[PDB]
Amino acid sequence: SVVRDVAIIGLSGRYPQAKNVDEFWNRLKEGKNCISEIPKDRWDWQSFFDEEKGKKESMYTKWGGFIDDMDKFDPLFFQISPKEAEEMDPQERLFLQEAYASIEDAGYTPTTLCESRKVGVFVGVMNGNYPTGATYWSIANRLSYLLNFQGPSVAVDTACSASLTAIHFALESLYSGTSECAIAGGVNLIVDPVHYMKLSALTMLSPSNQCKSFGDQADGFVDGEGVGAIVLKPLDKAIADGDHIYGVIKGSMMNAGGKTNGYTVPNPQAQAQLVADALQRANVHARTVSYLEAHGTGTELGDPIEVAGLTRAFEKDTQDKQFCALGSAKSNIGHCESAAGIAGVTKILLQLKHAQLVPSLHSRTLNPNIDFTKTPFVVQQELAEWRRPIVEINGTTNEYPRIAGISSFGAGGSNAHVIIEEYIPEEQKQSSLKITPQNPAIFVLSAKNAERLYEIVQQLLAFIQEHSLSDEHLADMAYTLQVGRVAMEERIAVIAGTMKELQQKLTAYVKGQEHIADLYRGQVNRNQEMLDILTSDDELEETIARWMERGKYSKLLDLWVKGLSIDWNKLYQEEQPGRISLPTYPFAKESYWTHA
Amino acid sequence: SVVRDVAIIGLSGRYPQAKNVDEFWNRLKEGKNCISEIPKDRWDWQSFFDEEKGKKESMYTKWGGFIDDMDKFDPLFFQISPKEAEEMDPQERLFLQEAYASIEDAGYTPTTLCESRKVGVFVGVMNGNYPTGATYWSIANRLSYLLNFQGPSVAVDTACSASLTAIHFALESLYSGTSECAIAGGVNLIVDPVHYMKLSALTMLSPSNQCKSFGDQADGFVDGEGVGAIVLKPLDKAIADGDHIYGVIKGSMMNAGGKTNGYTVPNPQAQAQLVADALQRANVHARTVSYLEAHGTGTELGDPIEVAGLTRAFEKDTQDKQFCALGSAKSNIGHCESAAGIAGVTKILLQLKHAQLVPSLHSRTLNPNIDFTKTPFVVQQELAEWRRPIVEINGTTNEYPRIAGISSFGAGGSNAHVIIEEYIPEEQKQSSLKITPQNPAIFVLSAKNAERLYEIVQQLLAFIQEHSLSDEHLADMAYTLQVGRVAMEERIAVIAGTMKELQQKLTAYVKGQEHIADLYRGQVNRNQEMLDILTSDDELEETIARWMERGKYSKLLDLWVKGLSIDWNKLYQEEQPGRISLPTYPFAKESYWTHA
């Protein structure tokens, strides 16, 4: 059916020196170059190193954007055996955890995300060097199997544009109704020196630690790793359901460069057509675009082509110059290939959250072959407020939302572009769920075991501190932990009317205090038998309803922590609180690897 | 936008013991089991063989569905160097040639297929064992680059359903208008014994040479190779353009099985939802489906599940029993994994062309665990006429077109289903292009060199003989060779008013006769200079128009064969002939392989 607005309601990712998107924002805001030496536990670069570029079976760099804990996984969480974990491509392992985390971020469980089970999974991937082989389909299908998703489930390979292609497919599936919700994202890990040898034989890499996006002395990209997922849902339903919305996807396009002067040479005419078509589908005039996340790989051939393509697309709508900021996350984290698009989308969503534009690195001296004064763009150099632009169209002048475009181009010529707009809510703050000591909140936390649960409490305390959460967040925090976290075997529950009270009790738990007022601990594993026989009947589900109404929280929580299933939604007879981002499950960091 | 009817206008494929779809039909019609011994030039099966199923680093079969000439390619045709051909996965090489052939089959050149260049390329693939690595994106992107296609270009991996997934994406791209035409298909080649070792470790293969689809003694599939492509175009425009139409895609669906009892266990409830959703999208009542091309891999677990899923989907519309024929091409050629869907589609299109149902092999004794009398289906045992069914719906009784469904299921649970209906043309046979000795036809043939051109003539003579073409085909044959073949360097041209005359002159050419009446030979390579300077001006394009009108064919052909570009469409002032299938370019069969 027709293009319609899609909300991004959930987000997770792991990028070089950024184990979550909060850390990623800090790297971006601070202008950090997140490139490091090839870790010895991947391979010894000295064994393959030669300064001669293009030499065979060698490499001429010692650098990359590497994520931490690439080989770690929590297979027991998923009832996967250690042997099966060893045989799984880490791309599959890490995407599974990040996708699970993105759903928790959204504030849903796998069950409640979509009651019909029509959840689509779309993942971009392009390198398959793990010793058990390229098995791309399983990166998508493992997620769909474990979480009982029955929408489309697909791995797509358009080389470096793959995760932005994946988003395009996810959107087309939502438009046609084959998905009601979708997980979209991508992954790229560097698991074998042949990865670098291939790129070095084609002289695609920089020798340095700088991906010089639109900068002087451009000499190829720094290779990088990344894994990311977003949760997509039609905007109208996300608003109706009280979801938290990072941004609105207005439209997307995919195309290819066709015949250029040689295979893998990019085509500025085709890039221009792509962007123009994405803007048309989004019903967005180019003069209202105020940030552009470029592909921006820092090659001498590609960067000028990219600016030429964008300028030509924008000039269909406007001749105005240097009104739109331009940047590329690759300047920070390198080029993470099939995950580059999802990393760029993540950067846009973080800029939108903070209404700030971050530096694009290594372009203090601009590419001397690009005259930006003849273009719509200024390559962003410093942290700055992202302003809503005032634009005269149709001889009407108005302030527009923050709108960004993002491009991702694959080496073989497959291109994608997505238009993302800030979500501006309607100002409805009845706040009839005000959390006070007279109307306290119920905080529930659970994990597969006590070690993980302990880590959950630590991360929650830290998150509260880091983001300066207070009493006004208690309602949404408790709701999200109630309905947006799977209730696992090891449980605690806390009643609190203020944040300080919650912090006090949780800190007391972390400090080992055996008895804490209004804090209940227990395990499901113990009372499985009596559970089975009483919850079948609504007779008891009605009894819970009365306990909640009467406010017998101590009773409900003393039962909940032993395994009594409670439909926390019944707690909210009038209205509903909103879902918010909170820390996600702290998967065990256990190493698994195979043998070639 | 909305689902609308899509024509299949072009077709090509290579399958075990079937180097083209004409041969494939002969294997299907004759009930041939196309399975062979693992060729020694792939590997020596004795080196790895052990009768113990599930043993590691071994295999317990000596069989597969192998195509001929898997390592052959004509890189010079595409201006690819021998070294680059060696480094290309043969999956990429063979898909490139089959896709090129499918466009020739349709009767288009890469230029005229779609003047806007918005040709999408969608290809399914799932194994990447060639020594230079899994590079799936290039299977699609090489085609888009060489033929200047600028629509979406993507490799999709949903494991064994991948080529039917690819078709679904192609359709969704045509509906949304991101493609105006599309190439869709898939490929699977078996290039390394590890391919068999993996499948044997999972005990997925039969020990035998029989894929026993819905048959007794089912014990796994026979692994197979395949490569196929179809050309897709909106039906209304295919009719308007005079294309030849194999069938009408009415609708498709993709979904996933979700959580089953173990990873890769198929879900009959999800298969049923898939098929029901495909029929709903196609606006097809299940009682009007009269052939079903099943996934049909011949496993004891999967075959009963598949029939259960189909029965449940069909029972939403009808309780009638055993009205629909059921079969699987895997019974003939084995399971060619990511190419299985395109092989099954090809079988449906051949059955439609001949209005015949072919045997499904190795089910003379049916699976004793499937009671087909409780289902819509009868597993087809013998060659039979495919009858248009008479069906009472809405208390109205009518004869319906031949309609088939096809399923393809991937091991990880990604499913697809497509509904294909016979194309029934409106009876318009003005035949104002009647080819006579008074109104003779112009036959043009060309190739990169004389050896290839000689092969073109032989194959055309043979095709005329094989398909009993005669005078009534001359108009469409000449038109297709005029506008549906790239005019290459080595050319011949023939004027003929009857088929016998054409056969006579072409046979004389093959026999070495230096001088033949009304047959012109020449090369472009020779007269490049004078060509450049005269054709620029329409002044001369107008002069051609008069020569054609005046009928100076000898003059035009004597010039054409030396390189003069002629717009053969101007030959047809009133009306237009139709495009027809004729043999496609006989690519050089040169071997290329790398070193691991």
GROMACS .gro file of C-alpha atoms in nm, chain A residues 192-417:
model
  226
  192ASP     CA    1   3.994  -1.309   1.000
  193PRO     CA    2   4.297  -1.128   0.852
  194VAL     CA    3   4.175  -1.223   0.506
  195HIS     CA    4   3.912  -0.949   0.561
  196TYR     CA    5   4.191  -0.691   0.563
  197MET     CA    6   4.395  -0.865   0.294
  198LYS     CA    7   4.109  -0.842   0.044
  199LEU     CA    8   4.049  -0.471   0.116
  200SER     CA    9   4.424  -0.402   0.100
  201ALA     CA   10   4.464  -0.584  -0.232
  202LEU     CA   11   4.201  -0.344  -0.370
  203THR     CA   12   4.379  -0.052  -0.196
  204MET     CA   13   4.050   0.051  -0.035
  205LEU     CA   14   4.188   0.117   0.313
  206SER     CA   15   4.368   0.417   0.457
  207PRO     CA   16   4.712   0.343   0.604
  208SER     CA   17   4.614   0.575   0.892
  209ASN     CA   18   4.369   0.586   1.180
  210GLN     CA   19   4.161   0.862   1.018
  211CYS     CA   20   3.865   0.823   0.788
  212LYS     CA   21   3.889   1.176   0.633
  213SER     CA   22   3.524   1.230   0.534
  214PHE     CA   23   3.517   1.531   0.297
  215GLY     CA   24   3.858   1.624   0.430
  216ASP     CA   25   4.191   1.703   0.273
  217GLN     CA   26   4.439   1.417   0.217
  218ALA     CA   27   4.162   1.157   0.181
  219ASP     CA   28   4.321   0.818   0.125
  220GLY     CA   29   4.059   0.551   0.188
  221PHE     CA   30   3.851   0.434   0.478
  222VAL     CA   31   3.937   0.282   0.812
  223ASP     CA   32   3.763  -0.054   0.838
  224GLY     CA   33   3.516  -0.094   1.125
  225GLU     CA   34   3.278  -0.320   1.318
  226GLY     CA   35   2.926  -0.246   1.429
  227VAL     CA   36   2.595  -0.405   1.520
  228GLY     CA   37   2.265  -0.227   1.554
  229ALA     CA   38   1.892  -0.270   1.550
  230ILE     CA   39   1.588  -0.046   1.552
  231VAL     CA   40   1.224  -0.131   1.618
  232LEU     CA   41   0.981   0.010   1.360
  233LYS     CA   42   0.606   0.061   1.399
  234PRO     CA   43   0.346   0.267   1.210
  235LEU     CA   44   0.347   0.614   1.366
  236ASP     CA   45  -0.024   0.636   1.439
  237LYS     CA   46  -0.018   0.321   1.645
  238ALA     CA   47   0.305   0.412   1.825
  239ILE     CA   48   0.143   0.738   1.936
  240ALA     CA   49  -0.176   0.561   2.039
  241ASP     CA   50   0.018   0.301   2.239
  242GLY     CA   51   0.223   0.559   2.433
  243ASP     CA   52   0.555   0.446   2.286
  244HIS     CA   53   0.867   0.660   2.304
  245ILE     CA   54   0.953   0.773   1.954
  246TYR     CA   55   1.311   0.854   1.849
  247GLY     CA   56   1.205   0.988   1.512
  248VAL     CA   57   0.971   0.943   1.217
  249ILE     CA   58   1.086   0.774   0.900
  250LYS     CA   59   0.918   0.978   0.627
  251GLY     CA   60   1.044   0.784   0.329
  252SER     CA   61   1.329   0.585   0.177
  253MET     CA   62   1.462   0.473  -0.159
  254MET     CA   63   1.694   0.209  -0.301
  255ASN     CA   64   1.854   0.210  -0.645
  256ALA     CA   65   2.175   0.117  -0.824
  257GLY     CA   66   2.442   0.303  -1.015
  258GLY     CA   67   2.422   0.114  -1.337
  259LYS     CA   68   2.708   0.139  -1.581
  260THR     CA   69   2.998   0.359  -1.470
  261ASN     CA   70   3.355   0.376  -1.596
  262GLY     CA   71   3.442   0.058  -1.410
  263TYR     CA   72   3.277  -0.188  -1.178
  264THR     CA   73   3.237  -0.038  -0.826
  265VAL     CA   74   3.287   0.320  -0.950
  266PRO     CA   75   3.000   0.524  -0.792
  267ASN     CA   76   2.756   0.717  -1.011
  268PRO     CA   77   2.666   1.074  -0.905
  269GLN     CA   78   2.366   1.084  -1.141
  270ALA     CA   79   2.219   0.770  -0.981
  271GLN     CA   80   2.291   0.899  -0.630
  272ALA     CA   81   2.110   1.220  -0.720
  273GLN     CA   82   1.810   1.026  -0.852
  274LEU     CA   83   1.805   0.818  -0.533
  275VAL     CA   84   1.796   1.118  -0.303
  276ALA     CA   85   1.543   1.307  -0.516
  277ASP     CA   86   1.319   0.999  -0.517
  278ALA     CA   87   1.350   0.955  -0.140
  279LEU     CA   88   1.254   1.320  -0.083
  280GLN     CA   89   0.960   1.290  -0.318
  281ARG     CA   90   0.838   0.974  -0.144
  282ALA     CA   91   0.883   1.151   0.192
  283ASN     CA   92   0.703   1.467   0.065
  284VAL     CA   93   1.001   1.666   0.195
  285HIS     CA   94   1.134   1.973   0.014
  286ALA     CA   95   1.515   1.969   0.014
  287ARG     CA   96   1.536   2.322   0.159
  288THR     CA   97   1.382   2.183   0.482
  289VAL     CA   98   1.656   1.923   0.524
  290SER     CA   99   1.896   2.057   0.785
  291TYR     CA  100   2.133   1.764   0.849
  292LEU     CA  101   2.272   1.509   0.599
  293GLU     CA  102   2.449   1.195   0.725
  294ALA     CA  103   2.666   1.115   0.427
  295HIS     CA  104   2.814   0.782   0.329
  296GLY     CA  105   3.139   0.977   0.362
  297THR     CA  106   3.397   0.700   0.339
  298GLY     CA  107   3.689   0.941   0.284
  299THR     CA  108   3.804   0.824  -0.058
  300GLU     CA  109   3.935   1.071  -0.311
  301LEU     CA  110   3.702   0.931  -0.579
  302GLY     CA  111   3.389   0.885  -0.371
  303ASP     CA  112   3.362   1.191  -0.156
  304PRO     CA  113   3.338   1.447  -0.441
  305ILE     CA  114   3.090   1.221  -0.624
  306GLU     CA  115   2.873   1.204  -0.316
  307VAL     CA  116   2.859   1.581  -0.276
  308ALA     CA  117   2.787   1.619  -0.648
  309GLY     CA  118   2.498   1.373  -0.625
  310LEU     CA  119   2.345   1.545  -0.323
  311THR     CA  120   2.383   1.891  -0.477
  312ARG     CA  121   2.211   1.782  -0.794
  313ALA     CA  122   1.925   1.623  -0.599
  314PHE     CA  123   1.883   1.926  -0.375
  315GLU     CA  124   1.897   2.167  -0.669
  316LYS     CA  125   1.573   2.020  -0.801
  317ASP     CA  126   1.410   2.207  -0.509
  318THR     CA  127   1.638   2.495  -0.416
  319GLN     CA  128   1.939   2.696  -0.525
  320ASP     CA  129   2.015   2.811  -0.171
  321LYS     CA  130   2.369   2.748  -0.055
  322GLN     CA  131   2.524   2.609   0.264
  323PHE     CA  132   2.201   2.581   0.466
  324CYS     CA  133   2.235   2.212   0.556
  325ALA     CA  134   2.492   2.055   0.786
  326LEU     CA  135   2.681   1.753   0.651
  327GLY     CA  136   2.878   1.488   0.836
  328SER     CA  137   2.966   1.121   0.862
  329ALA     CA  138   2.993   0.890   1.161
  330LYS     CA  139   3.270   0.712   0.969
  331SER     CA  140   3.498   0.997   1.070
  332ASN     CA  141   3.461   0.870   1.426
  333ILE     CA  142   3.422   0.490   1.406
  334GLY     CA  143   3.548   0.402   1.062
  335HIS     CA  144   3.347   0.230   0.791
  336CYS     CA  145   3.157  -0.063   0.936
  337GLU     CA  146   3.046  -0.183   0.591
  338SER     CA  147   2.709  -0.355   0.613
  339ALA     CA  148   2.647  -0.192   0.953
  340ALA     CA  149   2.738   0.158   0.834
  341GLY     CA  150   2.378   0.261   0.763
  342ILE     CA  151   2.243   0.157   1.101
  343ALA     CA  152   2.536   0.338   1.270
  344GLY     CA  153   2.451   0.653   1.076
  345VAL     CA  154   2.083   0.622   1.158
  346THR     CA  155   2.178   0.587   1.523
  347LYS     CA  156   2.386   0.904   1.506
  348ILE     CA  157   2.087   1.093   1.359
  349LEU     CA  158   1.858   0.965   1.634
  350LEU     CA  159   2.104   1.074   1.904
  351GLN     CA  160   2.140   1.417   1.743
  352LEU     CA  161   1.762   1.441   1.738
  353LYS     CA  162   1.732   1.339   2.102
  354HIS     CA  163   1.975   1.611   2.209
  355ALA     CA  164   1.885   1.864   1.935
  356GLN     CA  165   2.256   1.896   1.863
  357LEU     CA  166   2.488   1.859   1.566
  358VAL     CA  167   2.819   1.687   1.636
  359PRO     CA  168   3.161   1.729   1.472
  360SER     CA  169   3.250   1.545   1.156
  361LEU     CA  170   3.615   1.471   1.214
  362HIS     CA  171   3.930   1.512   1.004
  363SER     CA  172   3.788   1.784   0.775
  364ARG     CA  173   3.931   2.100   0.939
  365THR     CA  174   4.093   2.135   0.600
  366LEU     CA  175   3.825   2.042   0.349
  367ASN     CA  176   3.878   1.828   0.041
  368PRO     CA  177   4.028   2.091  -0.195
  369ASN     CA  178   3.846   1.929  -0.489
  370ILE     CA  179   3.502   2.001  -0.338
  371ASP     CA  180   3.386   2.365  -0.345
  372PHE     CA  181   3.122   2.353  -0.074
  373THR     CA  182   3.021   2.715  -0.137
  374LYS     CA  183   2.853   2.586  -0.456
  375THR     CA  184   2.650   2.329  -0.262
  376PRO     CA  185   2.372   2.312  -0.003
  377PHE     CA  186   2.618   2.195   0.260
  378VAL     CA  187   2.858   2.291   0.536
  379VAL     CA  188   3.062   2.004   0.682
  380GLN     CA  189   2.993   2.025   1.056
  381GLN     CA  190   3.309   2.106   1.252
  382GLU     CA  191   3.200   2.172   1.611
  383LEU     CA  192   2.928   2.069   1.853
  384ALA     CA  193   2.634   2.305   1.794
  385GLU     CA  194   2.262   2.339   1.854
  386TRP     CA  195   2.057   2.175   1.578
  387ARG     CA  196   1.815   2.453   1.483
  388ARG     CA  197   1.471   2.402   1.333
  389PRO     CA  198   1.499   2.589   1.000
  390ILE     CA  199   1.277   2.877   0.890
  391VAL     CA  200   1.193   2.826   0.524
  392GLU     CA  201   0.980   3.010   0.269
  393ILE     CA  202   0.803   2.761   0.040
  394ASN     CA  203   0.496   2.847  -0.165
  395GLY     CA  204   0.547   3.206  -0.056
  396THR     CA  205   0.460   3.088   0.294
  397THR     CA  206   0.727   3.111   0.563
  398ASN     CA  207   0.738   2.864   0.850
  399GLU     CA  208   0.964   2.689   1.097
  400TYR     CA  209   1.009   2.322   1.008
  401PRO     CA  210   1.101   2.024   1.224
  402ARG     CA  211   1.453   1.893   1.236
  403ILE     CA  212   1.479   1.670   0.928
  404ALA     CA  213   1.781   1.459   0.827
  405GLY     CA  214   1.867   1.247   0.527
  406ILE     CA  215   2.109   0.958   0.535
  407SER     CA  216   2.286   0.785   0.244
  408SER     CA  217   2.456   0.450   0.234
  409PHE     CA  218   2.629   0.319  -0.081
  410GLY     CA  219   2.758  -0.028  -0.149
  411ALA     CA  220   3.076  -0.099  -0.337
  412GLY     CA  221   2.888  -0.282  -0.612
  413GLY     CA  222   2.664   0.018  -0.668
  414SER     CA  223   2.354  -0.057  -0.457
  415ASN     CA  224   2.241   0.265  -0.294
  416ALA     CA  225   1.991   0.358  -0.028
  417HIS     CA  226   1.869   0.682   0.128
   0.00000   0.00000   0.00000
